[PDB]
Amino acid sequence: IATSPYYACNCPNNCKHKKGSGCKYHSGPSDKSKVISGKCEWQGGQLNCIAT
Incomplete structure (x- = not known):
């Protein structure tokens, strides 16, 4: 399974995923x-995966 939501969507650690990208x-x-x-969403500068 994917690691923490922060790292999965984070760019420096995972630029593959951008806002609107599933995760x-x-x-x-x-x-x-x-x-x-x-879904990956910006928290004001950092990308975090927000489970719906």
């Missing part, structure tokens, strides 16, 4: 975590 990320301990769908 996913796991939010839980160990493998027990589950991939959460979402």
Whole structure:
């Protein structure tokens, strides 16, 4: 599963994804975590994946 929402959408770490681009990320301990769908959105300068 994709890493944190911040890094997945972040440009310096992932410029592939831009605002409006779909994205996913796991939010839980160990493998027990589950991939959460979402969309990349700017938080005033940084790209973060916002799970809908």
